[model samples]
Target: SEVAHRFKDLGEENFKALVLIAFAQYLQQCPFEDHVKLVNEVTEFAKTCVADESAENCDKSLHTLFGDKLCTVATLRETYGEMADCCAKQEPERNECFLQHKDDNPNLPRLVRPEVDVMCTAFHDNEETFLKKYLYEIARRHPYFYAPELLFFAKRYKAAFTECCQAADKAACLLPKLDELRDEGKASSAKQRLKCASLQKFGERAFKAWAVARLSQRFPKAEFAEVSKLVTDLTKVHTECCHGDLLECADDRADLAKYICENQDSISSKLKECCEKPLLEKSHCIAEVENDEMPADLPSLAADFVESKDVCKNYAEAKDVFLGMFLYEYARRHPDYSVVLLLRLAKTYETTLEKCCAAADPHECYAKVFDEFKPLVEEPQNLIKQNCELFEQLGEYKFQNALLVRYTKKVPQVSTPTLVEVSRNLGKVGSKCCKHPEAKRMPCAEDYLSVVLNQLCVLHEKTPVSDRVTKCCTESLVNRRPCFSALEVDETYVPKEFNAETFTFHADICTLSEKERQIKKQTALVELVKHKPKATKEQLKAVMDDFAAFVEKCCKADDKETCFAEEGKKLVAASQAA
Candidate 1:
C-alpha cells in the first residue's frame, strides 16, 4: 500500500505540480487532510493508467508519469528496509536479503553499491559518473556499516578518490580522499600505510619539504632547504632500490653510502653553525684573549687551578676528554705551580685515564698513566698529609660511586686500622695547627666528622643494609643516651645531696630506712615457699636467703615496669621461704 501510494504520488504530473507549488508557498498552512486527499486521488489515477487495455501504451504512460520519481521512491523503500534490517534481531532470512540486495537494487539513485549498479544500468549508462558517485557514497555512508565492511569500502573509495584527486590540481581535492581513508576503524591499516610511505619516495619528499620550511624559518643561515632537497632525492632513490629488491646492487650501495655521509656532514655543519656563532660573540672570549696578551701571574694561576680542582676533574671526566687535557697542559705550562697544583693536575689526568680504561682495557690505558702520575701522590709534604686525611674520610664515597657505575667489580676494602691511625694523626696535626694563624684555612674536627657521615651515608646507599641510611641515622638520633650526672639517684634508694659543709659524704640514714621498709613489707607474706618451714637450721637459712633475694630484686627493678613487677613477686616468695 505504501509503495502504491508512493507510485501514485509520483505518477500524476498535475497533482505533483500542485503539491510542489503548495510546498513552495505555505507548506505548513496546507491541511494534512488536503494533502492526503490529493495523494490518494493521484495514486488512483496512476493505477488506472497502469491497468489500461493497451499494455505497451500503459507502460509508456506510466514511464511518462513517474520516470525519475519512480527510482527515488524505490530507493526510499530500499533504505527503509535496510535500516529496519540493521536494527532488527539476527534473522537469517532478513540478513541474507539485506546483504544480497544491499548492492543489487535496481531503482536506487546514482551512488555506491546497489545505487551505483542501478545508476550505471539505468541512469548513467555505466559511465564514469557511476564510479565517482559510488566512491562518494562509500565515503559518506561508511560510518554506518560493520567494521570489516566499512574498511573494505573505505579502501576502495580512497583508491578511486586518490586517483581522481591526483588527476586534479586544486590540492584541496586530495584532502577529502585522505579524510575518507582516515576512519578510526582502519587506523591500523592507515598507520601501516603511513609507515610504508614515510619510508618510501613520495612520503619522504613530503616530509622533507615540510621540515625544511619549518627549520629554514628558525635557522636562516643553515641552508636547510638545500639539505632537504638532497635528502629527499636520496630517500627516493633508496626507496626505489629497496622496493625493486636491488639492495645488493653496487651502484645502489655506493649511492646510499654517499648520501649517508653527506647527511652526517650536513647535520654536523648545521649544529656547529648554530653553536659557534653565539659562542664567538660572547664577551668572555675577548676578555680571555686580552688577559692572555698581558703578563700572567704564575702563583695566582696555580692557586686558581688548585681551588677549582673539583670543577677541573668534572670537565676531564666529561664526554669531551680533550677539554680536561687542555686544562692540564695549561696548568703544567705555568712556572709558579705548587706541588698541590701539580697533584690536582695529576688527579685530573688519572680521571681521564679511568674513562679511557672503560672505553678500552684498564691494563692497556690506565697502567701507563698511573705509573707516570704515581709520584704526584707522594710529592709535596703538605699535599700528602692533606690527601691522606681527605682520603681517610671520603674514600668510601668514591668507592661507592665507582661500584654503582660498575667501574669496579667490588668496593676495594681499605684497612680500618690504617684509617683510624691516619685519623688520630690528623687530629693531632689539627690541634697543633689550630694555634697557628692559618688554622682558619684548614678544616676542623666538625668538618671532618661531617665528611665521614656523608661518606657513610653514600656507602650505605650503594650497599644493602637493614634499613635506609636516613632511617638508621634517625634511629641513632632517637636512641642516643643522656649525659651522666652524679645528682641522679644511685642503684640503692639513696639520693646524693649537695652538702656545703663536708665536700661529699654518703649518709647511711636513707639506706637504713629502705632496709627497714623492705623487712616490714616481707613480714606479711611468709607461706608461699616450696620448702616449708621444718627445722631451726632451715628457718635461719631461709631468713638469710630472703634478705639476699630482697636485695637482688631491689637491684633488678631499676626503672623497667616488667622488671619491677617480677622483683615484687620475688620479694614475696623470698619472705615466704624465710
Candidate 2:
C-alpha cells in the first residue's frame, strides 16, 4: 500500500514504463563487458521481488548497485513493489488494467551526455562499444520512440559515426550530423503538433471521422479496415504526442510513416506517391493530396460550449480542463492569435463564469460576457505600445525601477508585497515583448501587457481596497490602464516623524506563524510609508530591506528582546539615512 500510495499518480502503466526505463538506464550505464553478468544479477534481483509487497526489501537488495548513479534504488524498489498488485491479476488483463487509472503527478522534475573531443576519443578506443553507448544515450533521451523508428535513428547515427570516425577531421564531420539529427526531430515534432492542433480544434471523434474519410478518398480501393487502422494509429499518436511527449510523438510518427510507405500497394497508390518524397515534403504532399466530402455529423466547434446554469457545477468538477477546453476552442477559431492572447481570452472567460455563477440568474449574467470582454482584448495594444516605447527609451534597468515606483504610488493602499509582485510582472511584460521583431513587436507587447492588466484587474475585483485604484479596476479593460495612468498621487497626505516605539515587538513575535509574520511586516511597511510620505520608492525599498535583514537575523538569536531592541535602533538610523 505504501508503494501503491506513493506512485498512485503514475498509474500502473507509467509506473511499469518508469521501472523498465530505470533498468534500461542502469544497464546502459554499466560497462559493456559487464552487461551479461549485470543482466543476470538484475534478473536475479527482480526474481526475488515476485509477490513481494515489501518496498524496503527490494531497496536493500539493489541500493549499492544503482546507488543514485543511474536511477536510485528507492524509485526502482517502489515501482517494482507496486507491480505486485498488478501481478496478482491474470495475464493480458493485467497490463491493460494497470494503465487504466492515473493520478496527477505534476511534480515530475524536468527529465541529461558528453563532449565531442572526449566522445571521439572514446569512439576511437572501442568502435563497437562506442556505437552501443551512442545508441543508449540517444534511446535514453527519447523515451517515446517506437522500436522501428528507434532502429531507423540508430541506423542513421551509426552511418554518421562510421563516416565521421573515418574522416580526416572527425569533429568537423560529426558536429553537423548531430545538428541535422536534432533538426530532423524538430521537423517531425512540428508536423505532429499540427496534427495535434487539428485534433484539439475538432474533437477526437469528429477529427478521426474526417481523417478516415480523407484517407479513404486517397485510397479508394484499399480495404476499409486497413484505412481505419491507419487513421486510428495517426490520431492516437496525435493525442499522445500533443501532451508534451516529444520523443513518443517522434517515434510514433516514424512508425506511422513506415506503416504507410512499407505497405505501399496495400494502402494507396497516391499515398505511396506522397510517401516517396522526403520527410517534410512527404507530409506536405499527404496533407494536400487527401480530400473528402465533409461529414454531416461533425459537431460545430463554433457553437458556445457552456450555455447552461450548471456551468458552475461543470467548472467546479474540472477547473483546469474547463479552462483548457476554452483555450483550445478559442485558439482554434482565432488561429492567428498568439498563445498569450488566447490565454487572456480564457482567463476573461473564467472570471466571467465566476461572477455569472454567483448571480441570481447565472445565464443572464453570462449572456454579455463576450461583449464585455471585447474592450479588455482590444485595449492592451495602446497600453503596451507606450510601455515598450518607454522601455526602449529608458532602457531595461531604468524602466523596471520606474514601473516599481509607478505602481507603488498608483496603488498606495496595496501592501508592499503586492506592489512589488505587480511591478515585477509588468517589468517582465516589457522585457519579454518589447524586443521582438519590428513587425511583431507591437502585437507581442499588446498581448503580454494585456495579460498583466487582466491579472491586476482580476486580483483587485476579488479584493477591492482603495476607491481610486478600485475605480481603475472597475473600468472597461480597454480603459483600465489609461485610468490608472491618469491618477495622481495622494497630494493631501503629510509625513509622520519616524518613531522608535513603532518598531518595538514582543519577545515571542518571532514565534508567530508565517501568515501572522507577513501581516506584521505589512503593518510596519504601511507605518514607514506614512512616516516617509515624500521618500522615493527606491529609498523606501532600501529601508525596507534593511529592516527585513535585521529582523531575519534577530529572529534566530537567543536574546530575542535584546535582538529586537538593537535592530530597531539600526532600522531608525537606516530610515533616517534613506
| Predicted structure with the largest lDDT when compared to the true one | 2
Model-by-model lDDT, in order? 0.36, 0.55
Quote the lDDT for 477 in model 1. 16
Q: How far does residue 16 in candidate 1 sit from its true spot (Å)? A: 38
> What local lDDT score does residue 576 receive in model 2, on the 0 to 100 scale?
60
Candidate 1 to truth, TM: 0.13
Each candidate structure's TM-score, on Cα atoms with residue i matched to residue i, is 0.13, 0.38
Worst 10 residues of 2 by lDDT: 98-107
Clashes in predicted model 1: 0
Q: Which stretches of model 2 miss by more than 4 angstroms?
A: 1-118, 125-128, 135-235, 238-252, 255-277, 280-336, 339-370, 382-387, 397-535, 538-575
**Residue by residue across 1-578, what tens digits does model 1's lDDT show?**
21222333223533333332222111122123444444566556556655453543344322223332222223454333444433323233232343233331223244323322343244335443444333333333221222222324434544554454235443454546546555543543333233343354234533433333323322233333454455455456445432322212223334444443445444333333323332213211221121011124434433443334244346445733343233334443432333223435544665665575456344344434435545543444354356445545645433222222221111113223323333343444444334433323233332233334433444455554324234544432111111100123123223223223221112221346754543332222121111222324446445656655754555554554455455445544544443
Local accuracy of candidate 2 as per-residue lDDT tens digits, 531-551: 566757766666556667777
TM-score of 2: 0.38
